[PDB]
């Protein structure tokens, strides 16, 4: 194609650990790069941008969808993957990975493992999940999905639904959206015990007030949440937060249902055939955003 | 090119020996052989650069997935691993988001049809319970062709656990439907005999082509003297609930109710021009004493397997 | 290119099972090839030397470090890896024949010492021994020697301590053989209790080399001041899996200014993290030298 693939220069050589490290301009640059990669790959073009570069996982907890998304992205850039399964100190493991790798993709059940990893690593680390902390590449792919499906991120009303306390995806997404866009409204839908934590909401208070972002907490998918949301973004944790075909009769015509996956019965299979079910297409947007990120980091 | 893809396989899932015609089988054979000549001469092929194969192995066999991996790599393709360690449909959709071809192995026989109804890219059935193993039948037939020269006219013994042997299920279908086989010996204890749901759909073609079918429970002198191909198999213990008395009887019958071991002594009765085959892996049914015999084709079979898998992958994805 | 990256011709098509199979010339040829590989990879050059060739690991015991090192090395030569995992009653020989039907090279690690010889009797393609019980680890010995050469500038004339479980340690078995057979080693310290000492079946065959080059060998139970003061290389290993063998910042005050501490890894408390910031701590650099030595080996085997 006549499209080019300029890497996002601000990401060069950088570790990706938080949604906080991206500007609005970084995000759009990554969206447009991901979209151009999508067009080339879908036309059958073979990219050889990262020939001879190695990605290695550091997955102290398992996620085949995550791991495989990253490997596929690296491979479609012409890069290669070396496996390193854990089942020795984290520091020694990291130094070992650094001896042969160009980029590390780390997932860890401890939230602070990223900081320790960063202090010894010589190559960029991409955070693929640090306990209940963040999942910054998921936030970026989630935002690509919103943009590609609805045409706009500014002005949206989004429901964040499920285990908001322990959901690292909703943490990164709220941060990324509120910091960089003019979000109209965020419904935070969860049982009181699993509400969105204060250590996510407080740093955002200034931006929320300045931009006039409306935050409403509920413990249920009310008819209001269903009638006003452009995006229903749901996660694993009962009948009052479930999205099924019956509940979808209240939804706008123009909206999407998203879910980072895996799901349980908070997202019924009765929704899967609805055009508005975006949660499978989300994963494909995932591959392309990850391609954009990797190329930008390693260019 | 030297390597024209088999046009009828373009974009299609490979699930049963029944989907292939005689012409398809010969086109794949000649493509596999052409690939073998190029690979053995040291040529690098770049036909599937940028394409991804991924597993969907719900019973595992790093053994079988690795043979498909090697084929993909020798076509210039790439591999992404997926560990099943969530619904079957959601898993498929996940692999579909990033892959070009899925290679699926599953303990349930009906999981393939479920997969097919949600999958967007081709699925290669690498084994569905005691159902089928279609690519094994293709590579087996390539082996017969390359080693003996002709498939029509052969006398073939299918030996061992024919009840649970997905290999012999696929192979019997592929041979009877597409070739004129002289005689099939079904050599097994009664408890592990070839199932009715394989034999009955083939009854019309068996009759119409005048294929001789004989059941035995032993490698008798007649079987040893007449067979061009002795195709033997492992007892599928994984398919048997050891604790139940039915399954313990089926288990025991392999040694207790049949005389079916191939060793060097038994091979003194074989023809000069024949081959011994086994899909592998094996246990004691096929003695290591046979391995030195020039008629022992079961290692060469795996090499033919690589090239047949390359022929199939290139044809599916071209 | 035969100018920049000439393969070591002696290794063409050959399985690598023991440190004993290499000459001094082979080792320097591998060292110079490994350094040239390093220069190109570090400058960002992409190698296409082994495009279309397949390395298959066959690891009957785990080692993410040894496994990933070989995989990285194959990939950086442009080669490919088939990710076979061990874990129906299939034998070792049949597993080997299976991998052999589609591979160009096998990399085998196994808890039984004799498994390598059984594999070699059936394999048609070269097998690289990545560790055979308490026998040998020949590619570790090679990368260890590259590490010494590169860090200190010379292998001839060094004083080296081999520390830890010398009885069961496959890395120290291969290293001692490779060094004494092919270099004029000044002095070897074998630092271990008698129960875990260097085996007699490693020392006895080196008798001729020890006499002919006048190599000094002393046993100690502990890491004495003398060992610390005279050693150019301190090569340590896990004592189990730790009485008076620990290297820490305090012990290092006794070391020469110019020397290196090495460890094939993983480590327990025999090598304190307090040493990690020292310029003499070469045990992380050692792993990177490993990749490049494995590149020189793979290229030489398969060219
Ligand atoms: N490997 C073949 C035969 C066997 O396992 O015995 C199969 O997967 O069906």
Instruction: Return the CATH class of domain C1-136+290-303.
Output: alpha beta
Residue of chain B whose Cα is closest to the Cα of C55: B70
For residue C294, give the H/E element and its range: helix C285-302
Q: Which residues of B touch A67 (CB under 8 A)?
A: 81
Alpha carbons B66 and B49: distance in angstroms, whole number: 18
Contact B145, B125 (CB under 8 A): no
CATH of B2-132+305-318, one of 3.40.50.1370, 2.60.40.10, 3.30.360.10, 1.25.40.10: 3.40.50.1370
CA distance C29 to chain B (A): 26
Rg (CA), chain B: 19
* Both structure tokens of C124: 């048609």
CA distance C260 to chain B (A): 40
**CATH topology classification for A135-285:** Rossmann fold (3.40.50)
Ligand 1 atom at minimum distance from B165 CA: 9
Contact C217, C187 (CB under 8 A): yes
- Which residue owns the Cα nearest ligand 1 atom 8? B127
- Which residue owns the Cα nearest ligand 1 atom 1? B280
Kindly list the strands in the beta sheet with A80-81, ordered across the sheet, starting from the edge strand earlier in the chain.
A80-81, A54-59, A103-108, A125-130
Q: B163 CA to middle of ligand 1, Å?
A: 13
Alpha carbons B122 and B116: distance in angstroms, whole number: 8
Q: Which of B166, B238, B278 to mutate to test the pocket of ligand 1 (most atoms within 8 A of CB)?
A: B166
Q: Where are the alpha helices (DSSP H) in chain B?
A: 22-40, 62-74, 88-96, 111-118, 134-148, 166-178, 196-209, 221-226, 245-256, 264-267, 298-317
Alpha carbons B5 and B8: distance in angstroms, whole number: 9
* Both structure tokens of B111: 């999981």
Alpha carbons B113 and B13: distance in angstroms, whole number: 11
Alpha carbons A123 and A298: distance in angstroms, whole number: 10
Torsion from C-alpha of A135, A139, A145, A148, nearest 10 degrees: -140
Contact C82, B66 (CB under 8 A): yes
Resolution in A: 2.0
Those residues whose C-beta lies under 8 Å from the C-beta of residue B263, and which sit 6 or more positions away, are B287, B289, B290
CA–CA distance from A41 to each of A75, A145, A286, B79, B120 (Å)?
12, 17, 14, 16, 16
* Torsion region of C89: left, alpha or beta (phi above 0 gives left; psi -120 to 50 gives alpha): left
Alpha carbons B5 and B110: distance in angstroms, whole number: 30
* Both structure tokens of B246: 């039915």
- In this structure, the residues whose C-beta lies within 6 A of any atom of ligand 1 are B 64, 127, 133, 166-167, 234, 279-281
Nearest to B188 by CA among B155, B144, B226, B232: B232
Alpha carbons A127 and B275: distance in angstroms, whole number: 55
Those residues whose C-beta lies under 8 Å from the C-beta of residue C9, and which sit 6 or more positions away, are C300
Alpha carbons C110 and C68: distance in angstroms, whole number: 16
Question: In a 3-state reduction of DSSP, which class is residue A256?
Answer: strand
Q: Hunting for tokens 């390693």 — which residue is that?
A: A298
Mark yes or no for CB contact C72/A97 under 8 Å: no
Domain A1-134+286-299 identical in fold to domain A135-285: yes
**Parallel/antiparallel/unpaired status of strands A231-234 and A256-258:** parallel
Beta partners for C271? C247
Q: Which residues of C touch A97 (CB under 8 A)?
A: 68
**CATH topology classification for C137-289:** Rossmann fold (3.40.50)
Mark yes or no for CB contact B44/C52 under 8 Å: yes
Q: Hunting for tokens 């493991």 — which residue is that?
A: A93
Question: In a 3-state reduction of DSSP, which class is residue C13?
Answer: coil
Nearest 5°: the CA angle B28, B108, B25 is 10
Ligand 1 atom at minimum distance from B63 CA: 1
For residue B105, give the H/E element and its range: strand B101-106
Q: Which residues of B touch A263 (CB under 8 A)?
A: 90
Nearest to A205 by CA among A215, A195, A192: A215
- Which residue owns the Cα nearest ligand 1 atom 6? B234
Alpha carbons A192 and C211: distance in angstroms, whole number: 80
Farthest-apart Cα atoms in chain A, separation: 55
Given a contact as 3+ CB pairs under 8 Å, which chains touch B? A, C
Alpha carbons B288 and B296: distance in angstroms, whole number: 10
Q: B271 CA to middle of ligand 1, Å?
A: 27
Ligand 1 atom at minimum distance from B236 CA: 6
Q: Which residues of B touch A40 (CB under 8 A)?
A: none
Nearest to C67 by CA among C28, C11, C106, C119: C106
**CATH topology classification for A1-134+286-299:** Rossmann fold (3.40.50)
Q: Hunting for tokens 């490693």 — which residue is that?
A: C202
Contact B169, B161 (CB under 8 A): no
Alpha carbons B193 and B169: distance in angstroms, whole number: 11
Question: In a 3-state reduction of DSSP, which class is residue C262?
Answer: strand
Around C27, how many Cα atoms within 13 Å sit in the side-chain half-sphere?
Answer: 31
Contact B7, B317 (CB under 8 A): no
Q: C35 CA to middle of ligand 1, Å?
A: 46
Instruction: Return the CATH class of domain B133-304.
Output: alpha beta
Q: B174 CA to middle of ligand 1, Å?
A: 17
CA–CA distance from C251 to each of B20, B308, C165, C254 (Å)?
73, 62, 20, 6
Mutate to test the interface with C, among A58, A82, A93, A102 (most CBs of C within 10 A): A82
Which residue ranges make up each domain of chain C?
1-136+290-303, 137-289
């Amino acid at each position: 194609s006549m499209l080019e693939l300029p890497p996002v220069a601000s990401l060069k050589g950088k570790s990706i650990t938080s949604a906080e490290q991206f500007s609005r301009a970084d995000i759009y640059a990554l969206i447009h790069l991901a979209s151009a990669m999508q067009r080339k790959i879908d036309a059958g073009e073979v990219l050889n941008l990262l020939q001879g570069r190695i990605m290695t996982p550091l997955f102290f907890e398992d996620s085949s969808r995550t791991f495989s998304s990253f490997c596929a992205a690296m491979i479609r850039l012409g890069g290669s993957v070396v496996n390193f399964k854990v089942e020795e100190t984290l520091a020694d493991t990291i130094r070992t990975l650094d001896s042969y790798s160009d980029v590390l993709v780390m997932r860890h059940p401890r939230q602070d493992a990223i900081e320790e990893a960063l202090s010894v690593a010589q190559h960029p680390i991409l955070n693929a999940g640090n306990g209940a902390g963040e999942h910054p590449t998921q936030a970026l792919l989630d935002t690509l999905t919103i943009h590609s499906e609805l045409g706009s991120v500014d002005g949206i009303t989004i429901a964040l639904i499920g285990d908001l306390k322990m959901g690292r995806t909703v943490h990164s997404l709220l941060k990324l959206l509120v910091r960089n866009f003019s979000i109209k409204c965020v419904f935070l839908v969860a049982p009181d015990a699993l509400q969105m934590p204060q250590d996510v909401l407080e740093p955002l208070q200034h931006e929320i007030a300045t931009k006039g972002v409306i935050i409403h907490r509920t413990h249920a998918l009310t008819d209001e949440v269903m009638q006003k949301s452009d995006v229903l973004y749901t996660t694993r944790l009962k009948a009052d937060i479930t999205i099924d075909a019956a509940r979808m009769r209240l939804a706008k015509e123009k909206m999407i249902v998203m879910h980072p996956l895996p799901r349980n019965d908070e997202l019924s299979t009765t929704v899967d055939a609805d055009p508005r079910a975006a949660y499978f297409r989300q994963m494909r947007y995932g591959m392309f955003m990850r391609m954009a990120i990797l190329w930008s980091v390693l260019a």
